[PDB]
Design a protein around this nucleic acid. Structure first.
Length: 246
RNA sequence: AUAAACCGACGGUAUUGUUCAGAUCCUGGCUUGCCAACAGGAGUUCCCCGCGCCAGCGGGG
């Protein structure tokens, strides 16, 4: 679960070794973190995920509170309160509503993980210029990040596959902070602006599925359904045991 | 053994056809190259040779 267990790849703001923390450790400490992945595009995909998460779990009621939470980390009790009604929507492996997935996908073959690795494959020259086996075994964090990247920044897999709400390959622009905690909070719209931004079906595509060949008025989409939009029918396979993430 | 390694930008293709540079036109007038002068001096020629009066005369290279 993205709200509970460790999955966030960080290292100290000016420190060294990578450690995998959880959302609570990020929101409830004056520790300075910065995202750390081998790819800048995945670091951005991760931040986008974090921001979209913090957008639904803790919009400030006003600018006064907005400035307060930035300078002051929440307490673990406040955090648990806020994440409580959302735990149900952030499960990777889940019975009826897997995170950004769709149970019951009819496919003759199993798609390799490289197809979510945005650029490792996609062109006829990729197999010649890129290193093989980058997607043989992806950890939980990278998998979610990759899924979120495909739905937002990357183009569709091919014919019959749709792209995100902003279209194919949009430019994402976030306000930069001093550390990871501040940056995430800095990009969360306060409740008033949130209402002015979105004046609907406010349930995800993996809980309230999209109907085939249906026409959807853009105004009929809730902000959480849109932020976590999944234009593609994707279903993860059963994972494997302990080892290095490729 | 380095965003490295392995690794063609490739294949075909007339720039062609036409066209006086042409008519007229002194380079022209003047102007010593000039003064002096034995082609004479100087016997080296290195050999072989034959005949002398020892001075010098000959034939071969």
């Amino acid at each position: 679960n993205l709200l509970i267990d460790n999955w966030i790849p960080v290292r100290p703001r000016n420190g060294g070794k990578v450690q995998i923390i959880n959302l609570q450790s990020l929101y409830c400490s004056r520790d300075q973190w910065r995202l750390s992945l081998p790819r800048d595009d995945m670091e951005l995909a991760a931040l986008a995920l974090l921001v979209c998460i913090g957008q639904i779990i803790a919009p400030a009621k006003d600018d006064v509170e907005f400035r307060h939470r930035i300078m002051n980390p929440l307490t673990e009790d406040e955090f648990q309160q806020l994440i409580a009604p959302w735990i149900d929507m952030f499960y990777l492996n889940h019975a009826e509503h897997p995170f950004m997935q769709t149970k019951g996908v009819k496919a003759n073959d199993v798609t390799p993980m490289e197809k979510l690795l945005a650029g490792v494959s996609g062109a006829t020259n990729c197999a010649f210029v890129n290193q093989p086996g980058q997607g043989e075994a992806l950890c939980g964090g990278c998998t979610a990040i990759a899924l979120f990247n495909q739905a937002n920044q990357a183009p569709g897999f091919g014919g019959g596959f749709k792209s995100g709400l902003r279209g194919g390959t949009p430019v994402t622009t976030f306000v930069r902070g001093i550390d990871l905690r501040s940056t995430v909070l800095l990009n969360v719209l306060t409740l008033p602006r949130l209402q002015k931004q979105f004046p609907t079906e406010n349930q995800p595509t993996w809980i309230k599925p999209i109907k085939s060949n249906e026409s959807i008025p853009a105004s009929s989409i809730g902000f959480v359904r849109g932020l976590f939009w999944q234009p593609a029918h994707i279903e993860l396979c059963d994972p494997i045991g302990i080892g290095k993430c490729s």
